[PDB]
Design a protein around this ligand. Structure first.
Ligand SMILES: O=C(O)[C@@H](O)[C@H](O)[C@H](O)COP(=O)(O)O
Ligand SMILES: O=C(O)[C@@H](O)[C@H](O)[C@H](O)COP(=O)(O)O
Ligand code: NI
Ligand code: NI
Lengths: 187, 187
């Protein structure tokens, strides 16, 4: 039986999607992710702020089909490091992804199975192409929420494990009032 | 070898993607698409207007990779029928598509291989899920350009022929100042 086509309203101001399933990631949910463990533990104990929320509209895992989701990435820093999404590779490594930036100032960090990294800046209107085999993470480098829509293959799945253990070969920090992408000492 | 990640600017007011492949379809490229053949002949002679332009960023046709494109669908009528895109099924029938409406007033007409139809209104912010197996055509029901962004599997391909010969089982016309979706009499 064919699936029913539908339309859902996406609010470009809030990132809210009608009919989507919500996910909330708090700072506590990201242990071992930031370089400055002291600032992390401090921020968690003090307020454990929400780092980001995802509104996902997903299908059964089937070749050729597509999922889409917005993310609202809140502004913040853990020590010198800007708030970011956990980041992942796809379970089916060769699945690509397309991001559309809607609001705020941010960017995407990407890296290969081997660690070679790239940084792509994102402002409203920017569409980012995430090629097959690249892990990807988004970072809010500004003062307001960074909101974007992502469209990805239904069967792409997720590999958070690799990233959670080694992180990205680079980190994005504020140094002298400036955003800088630098080597991860933890790597 | 890994492909290079990249970002491109999409302009939400004009639908133009900087550096993208541009395609232009004029009414003369749409012989046998509109119900009112005489009105089609007449409008082509008087003016041969651009019905739509597409700005496409495509990858090689491999499983799991993704293409994206904007379309600028111009306002107009052929007789009583609103300007529309040619419409197609995918070559790999079971490939889905996701559409994001950016500007203007329109909608999508979809139908199964058996001719069952569905109409989904589109205003700015509407995201439409085009399921596996469903042919899809966009229609402009207002007086300004209807602009939207579409993301689709790189291997989906196109099947235009099926629609080129028999059309869609429904049409979208203006009747008594109102938009109406009704049976295609030539189907
Ligand atoms: O599909 C995606 O890759 C995004 O929707 C991310 O899942 C989302 O931004 C949250 O990031 P992560 O999944 O890395 O926690
Ligand atoms: O991926 C899509 O289906 C869209 O980009 C359409 O191709 C585009 O709107 C043009 O319509 P058609 O391809 O039916 O002429
Ligand atoms: Ni992903
Ligand atoms: Ni299509």
């Amino acid at each position: 039986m064919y699936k029913e086509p539908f339309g859902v309203k996406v609010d470009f101001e809030t990132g809210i999607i009608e009919g989507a399933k919500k996910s909330v990631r708090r700072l506590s949910d990201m242990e071992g992710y930031f370089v400055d463990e002291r600032a992390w533990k401090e921020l968690v104990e003090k307020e454990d702020p929400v780092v980001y929320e995802v509104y996902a509209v997903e299908q059964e895992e089937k070749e050729g089909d597509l999922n889409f989701a917005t993310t609202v990435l809140y502004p913040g820093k853990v020590g010198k490091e800007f708030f970011f999404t956990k980041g992942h590779f796809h379970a089916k490594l060769d699945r690509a992804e397309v991001y559309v930036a809607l609001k705020g100032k941010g960017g995407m960090l990407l890296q290969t199975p081997e660690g070679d990294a790239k940084w792509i800046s994102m402002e409203p209107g920017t569409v980012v192409y995430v090629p097959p085999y690249w892990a990807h993470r988004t970072v809010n480098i500004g003062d307001e929420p960074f909101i974007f829509l992502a469209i990805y293959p239904a069967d792409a799945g997720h590999d958070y494990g690799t990233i959670a253990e080694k992180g990205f070969s680079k980190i994005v920090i504020e140094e002298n009032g400036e955003v800088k992408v630098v080597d991860n000492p933890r790597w």
